Copies of this chain bind each other. A is one copy, B any other.
Amino acid sequence: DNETLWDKLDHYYRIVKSTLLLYQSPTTGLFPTKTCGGDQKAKIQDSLYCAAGAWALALAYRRIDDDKGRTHELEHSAIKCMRGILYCYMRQADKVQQFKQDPRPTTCLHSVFNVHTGDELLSYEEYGHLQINAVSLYLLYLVEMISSGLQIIYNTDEVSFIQNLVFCVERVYRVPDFGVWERGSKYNNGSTELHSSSVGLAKAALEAINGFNLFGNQGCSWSVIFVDLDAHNRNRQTLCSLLPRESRSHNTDAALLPCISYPAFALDDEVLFSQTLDKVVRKLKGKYGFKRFLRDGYRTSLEDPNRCYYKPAEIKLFDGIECEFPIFFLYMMIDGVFRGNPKQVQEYQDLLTPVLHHTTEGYPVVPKYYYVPADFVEYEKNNPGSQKRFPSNCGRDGKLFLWGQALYIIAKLLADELISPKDIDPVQRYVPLKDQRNVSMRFSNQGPLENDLVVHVALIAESQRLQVFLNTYGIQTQTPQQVEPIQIWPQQELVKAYLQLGINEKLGLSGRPDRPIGCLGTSKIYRILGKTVVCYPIIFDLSDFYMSQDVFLLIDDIKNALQFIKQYWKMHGRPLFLVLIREDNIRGSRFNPILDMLAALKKGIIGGVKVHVDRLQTLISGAVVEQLDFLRISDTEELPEFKSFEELEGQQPDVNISEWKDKPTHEILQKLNDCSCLASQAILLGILLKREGPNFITKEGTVSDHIERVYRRAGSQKLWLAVRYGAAFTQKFSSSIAPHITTFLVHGKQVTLGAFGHEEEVISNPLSPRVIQNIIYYKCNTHDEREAVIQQELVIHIGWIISNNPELFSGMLKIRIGWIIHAMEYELQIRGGDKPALDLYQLSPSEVKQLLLDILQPQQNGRCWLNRRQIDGSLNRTPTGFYDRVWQILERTPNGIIVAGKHLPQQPTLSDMTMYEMNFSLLVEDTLGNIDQPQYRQIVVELLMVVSIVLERNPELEFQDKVDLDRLVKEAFNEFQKDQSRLKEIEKQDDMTSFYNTPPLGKRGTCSYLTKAVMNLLLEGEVKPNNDDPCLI
């Protein structure tokens, strides 16, 4: 090996010039998908890699002073594609504005373009253009090339579009997409899903592009890109939630490999990285490459090329015959070099060589995929990995896989140590176990295992009367006026300032959409127009919802926000969490709890979060303070001075709903004057807005603001009846609800919003705030408007629990809040006894929260097992692994399972699903959805458990006929009935109550009754002898 380094790079010089740089589009700089055939199609994602391949060789070409001009040819080969990629997106800047406001498949940036003009080729109907990775990979690569010194962004107008490109990528945590393989899922029905590979890339893209100057070394404060920390965090939360699964339909996908490595390295958790990794390695590795995913029908022998969609049952025909992609070996080879283990480079090089092809000139060719011939699909299905596969691309045919060709150049250079990993990844994305001090990248000063962040908390009082009153009890609250350099702003105020970020009228982009700023954003310190700004978190706002005025709720809203900042805030400086105390907090008995948290806040630890209590001037002196120059680069120094926080200088309802709603006469208006309750006029003025128009006038004025003034009055004086009708008949929404439903649904927890016994809407995939508004109020509930107000309460409370106590919502596939209200109200009937129970519409939100915690706790306490079965059954709490076990029950049962008029067959269920599959869980719930009586349902699941603990231990007994659990349930009850009749002869007939209070496990437990039932029915069939286990008799 005496060749000069000129020689080895010339070896790689050829390959790129002959196999990738020959086919680069001279006009748009793009890289066509099909090298031969005359196709104009160029994809966003693959074209990014092709430029990076020349970039990788370009960095290798930086090591020679005598490059004969090769370095600039390969450096600007990347720039030509990225600028052409950049050029394509503006061409669609109208779509970018639409996707920013309303994320949808029909408003997104496109993914395929004319290679020779850059014009749009396929419409939304023809092609699924929602591919977040392509936009995210662009932003991740764009900073990656700019950091190395390439100049792609040329003027401030491109800065605004890339800034707006961040605003689109900021919302990928909740917008589903078709993903890398433009299919969406394994079913290929055109239905969009959330993918970890797509979501992870945006997190990596936002991490690198945050604060990055698009102008490189030649840049100033007007060329930095600002990334919403909250939007990145919500995307970060989704990525760990979905993983190790790529999507709902995908248990594991080999497309996760770019997600956990080159280009993203988006996972900062090694363990997860390991668990994500093996499921890719174990389930998708093959001799000829990595299969895209299990049951992938892309370019398979059993797939009709004409149809653009796959039949729901066609999926099982793709099992064991998935095409193996050699490119994913090249991905692994880079992984070996980057993370320092050398074998992984060699073992995945030894697999790449046999599947590698060559041109006429000897230049190696990376095939796209290897497909098993239709002549051998049966043999391949029987024994996978034993039949030869034919390459999609072989060379000498005119077809080359440029994305694979690009990775080949990158991987070999790192393997040959012609590019060091630090050069090819300039904005560290792979950080070794030495994981400290990376902005937005989970590595704070403490590192990857310590999270004892000390959060800077400043106490701000609403009024001067308050701060003296708080001082008299030992709490030291500064006040707004006291701090002139420091101007305190509402979180909605930072939005207006942020509508000016990325504004360009020339391309017609409006900037950052009007959105609430989360805890992480409000945690920073800001400079707008030269005035120092500190924003108190949105959890102190009294407009979004009516749960914020309750001190006990505000007591925990501070607590979980403090926990949220402590664990997610991984920036350089310490966050600022301003606290704001209003008069309504102190007045009444509400002073007692707020003082204690203030006192514990003084101590230095709250909610397990270390805090630093001091004056706002002291707490801001040297921290890294966020710069708001875009409000000044447009010369808007005379922008209106943003409105800082300003210092301020008893019976049950005697009127029943049915009593006067049924009353026909319109005299009820006189009753409004006759009645004196605050909750009353919440209704009379509420029906007034419906009965005689929206903006009718009365004694005080237009009725529209009276309901609002009542709600303002009601919330402060804490008669929570009126504050619920007032908040219902005015149709208000909390902005925190919109991504609450997203958070539940990305955990696999299906959300439905409809009252018990009324129409319920299934939210399978997440929707936008506009859509959920009509579902909350208009279409779902019309019997009572106040149903939404209580409905809107828990979905914030559920969001609180799912974060603080994730385990508490385990076992339930779906959180039906409407049934939770029925569960919520029914337990009070048990709690109240022979007394008119407390109304759920009368309790304060903390009581609703504490009620929610009490009855959704684990071991329900002191409940006759009847009440446990009511709570658990109405709550749809299923045992851990219940869905797994019924699959096993469904596996060795010929005639499936019948539950109260539904039929769960063995086929096509077994062929179309997997034992861990998420889709199967819905079907069994659909099978059990008809159980009207909740304790019957819990009896059904234990019976379903009972056969499971029966069947798996007892592998010889199989069903012969259909399994109707109702017959299994009753026969257990009658044989139950005879024994207790033998004891005391209970005269109640057809009453399940004696069965429900019976404990599952005990002397004569419900399980013991149930297994006898399942023992007999199994015993009425053939006892199959095992080949594995010989029989002694």
Residues of A participating in the B interface, judged by any CB pair closer than 8 Å: 5, 62-66, 436, 444-447, 450, 452-454, 574, 610
Q: Are A63 and B446 in contact (CB under 8 A)?
A: yes
Interface pair B452/A65, CB less than 8 Å apart: yes
In chain B, what residue has the closest Cβ to A63? B445
Report B-chain residues with C-beta under 8 Å of the C-beta of A453.
65
A63 touches B436 (CB 8 A): yes
The residue from B5, B62, B63, B65 contacting A610, defined by CB atoms under 8 A apart: B65
Having A5-B450, A64-B445, A65-B454, one finds 14 other A-B pairs with CB under 8 Å, namely A63-B436, A63-B445, A63-B446, A63-B447, A64-B446, A64-B450, A64-B452, A65-B444, A65-B445, A65-B446, A65-B452, A65-B453, A66-B452, A66-B454
Contacts A/B (CB < 8 Å), 14 sampled:
A5-B450, A62-B445, A63-B446, A63-B447, A63-B450, A64-B450, A64-B452, A65-B445, A65-B452, A65-B454, A65-B574, A66-B452, A66-B454, A66-B610
A574 contact set on B, CB distance < 8 A: 65
A610 cross-chain contacts in B, Cβ below 8 A: 65-66
List of 3 A-B pairs having minimum Cβ-Cβ separation, nearest first: A65-B454, A66-B454, A65-B453
Summarize A's interface: helix, strand, loop or mixed.
Answer: loop
| Residue of A450, A453, A574, A610 contacting most chain B CB atoms (<10 Å) | A450
Report A3 CB to chain B, min CB distance, Å. Answer: 14
**Distance in Å: Cβ of A610 to nearest Cβ of chain B:** 5
Residue of A64, A66, A454 most packed against chain B (CB within 10 A): A66
Instruction: List B contacts of A447 (CB < 8 A).
Output: 63
- The residue among A63, A65, A66, A444 with the most chain B CB atoms within 10 A of its own CB is A65
Report B-chain residues with C-beta under 8 Å of the C-beta of A444. Answer: 65
Q: Which chain B positions have C-beta within 8 A of A62?
A: 445
> Closest residue to A444 on the B side, CB-wise?
B65
Chain B: minimal CB distance from A437 (Å): 9
Copies per assembly: 2
Of A63, A444, A454, most buried by chain B (CB within 10 Å of CB) is: A63
- Within the complex, the shortest CB–CB distance from A57 to chain B, in Å, comes to 15
A446: B residues at CB distance < 8 A: 63-65
Write out the residue numbers on chain B whose beta carbons fall within 8 Å of the beta carbon of A454.
65-66
A603 to B: closest C-beta gap in Å: 13
**Which residues of B sit under 8 angstroms from A5, Cβ to Cβ?**
450
A66 proximity list for chain B (CB < 8 A) = 452, 454, 610
B residues in contact with A64, CB < 8 Å: 445-446, 450, 452
- Residues from chain B with a CB closer than 8 A to the CB of A436 are 63
Least Cβ–Cβ distance between A563 and chain B, in angstroms: 15
Min CB–CB distance A527 → chain B (angstroms): 16
Measured between C-beta atoms, what is the minimum distance from A626 to chain B in Å?
Answer: 16
CB nearest neighbor in B for A61? B445
Residue of B nearest to A610 (CB): B66
Q: In the complex, A111→B174 CA distance in Å?
A: 66
Q: For residue A55, give the distance in angstroms from its CB to the closest CB of chain B.
A: 16
A604: nearest chain-B partner, CB-CB: B66
What chain B residues lie within 8 Å of A65 (beta carbons)?
A: 444-446, 452-454, 574, 610
Q: Enumerate chain B residues within 8 angstroms of A452, measured Cβ to Cβ.
A: 64-66
Q: How far is the CB of A567 from chain B (nearest CB, A)?
A: 13
Minimum CB–CB distance for A8 against chain B, Å: 13
Residue of B with least CB distance to A454: B65
Name the distance in Å between A6's Cβ and chain B's nearest Cβ.
9
Question: What residue of chain B has the Cβ atom nearest to residue A455's Cβ?
Answer: B65
Which of A62, A436, A445, A574 counts the most B-chain CB atoms under 10 A from its CB? A445
Q: Which B residues are CB-close (under 8 A) to A450?
A: 5, 63-64
| Nearest residue, chain B, Cβ from A5 | B450
Report the minimum CB–CB distance from A213 to chain B (whole Å).
15
Q: What's the nearest-Cβ distance from chain B to residue A143, in Å?
A: 20
* A218: min CB distance to chain B, Å: 11
Closest-CB distance, A86 to chain B (whole angstroms): 23
Q: How far is the CB of A523 from chain B (nearest CB, A)?
A: 14
Chain B residue at smallest Cβ distance from A62: B445
Closest CB-CB distance, A624 to chain B, in whole Å?
A: 10
Closest to A64 in B: B446
Closest residue of chain B to A453 (Cβ to Cβ) is B65
* Chain B residues within an 8 Å CB radius of A63: 436, 445-447, 450
A571 to chain B, nearest CB (A): 12
A445 / chain B contacts, CB cutoff of 8 Å? 62-65
A67: nearest chain-B partner, CB-CB: B454
In the complex, the chain B residue whose C-beta lies closest to that of A611 is B66
- Name the residue of chain B whose CB is nearest to the CB of A445: B63
